[PDB]
């Protein structure tokens, strides 16, 4: 999913998932969660 020119509700994303592991390179979660970006790209899959 490619996101450009939109706004996302963080309240929902906090509740719809229970995070078990963060691992970030170059960025931190509370910079995607507090800053505005030219584009987001999310690759999602089902993984044990």
């Amino acid at each position: 999913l490619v996101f450009s020119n939109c706004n996302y509700n963080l309240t929902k994303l906090l509740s719809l998932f229970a995070v078990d592991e963060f691992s970030c390179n170059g960025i931190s979660p509370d910079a995607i969660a507090r800053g505005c970006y030219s584009t987001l790209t999310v690759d999602y899959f089902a993984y044990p």
Partner: protein, 145 residues
């Protein structure tokens, strides 16, 4: 998950070349079983045409039991300077959203996904208006539309 994806070649079909994917790319063995593998270690064979290279493409798939709760993986990537529109968290329009009266004072600007510190003045239009940011040789912002 796919555990073996290799190309068979040879008159005796005795040459195996493992096929590896590049970052952020799909696999040629994706279309063997797009949904899932019905049995552990399931093996599929398919023939390739001359345009792709030819031979017997081979795939093997492994099956892992489903857990009580669906567990998911996400890869998030942020791209800078890929346009003139931005992705943002839902937030109220800040009262600091105007600059018409604070010309000449150092401010921390966050404009459409480009961030920095600067002083704004009124100037004549240069560059292409369509792209909203004018840069110098050293990748510093010098004009804003």
């Amino acid at each position: 998950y796919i555990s073996k994806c290799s190309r068979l070649t040879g008159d005796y079909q005795h040459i195996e070349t493992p096929l590896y994917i590049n970052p952020g790319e799909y696999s040629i063995c994706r279309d063997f079983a797009p949904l899932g593998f019905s049995e552990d270690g399931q093996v599929f064979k398919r023939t390739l045409t001359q345009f792709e290279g030819g031979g017997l493409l081979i795939g093997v798939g492994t099956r892992v039991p489903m857990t009580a709760n669906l567990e998911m993986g996400f890869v998030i990537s942020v791209q800078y300077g890929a346009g003139t529109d931005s992705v943002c968290p839902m937030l109220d329009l800040g009262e600091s959203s105007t600059i018409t009266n604070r010309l000449g004072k150092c401010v921390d600007y966050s404009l459409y996904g480009v961030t920095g510190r600067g002083v704004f003045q009124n100037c004549t239009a240069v560059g292409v208006k369509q792209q909203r940011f004018v840069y110098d040789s050293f990748d510093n912002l010098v004009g804003y539309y």
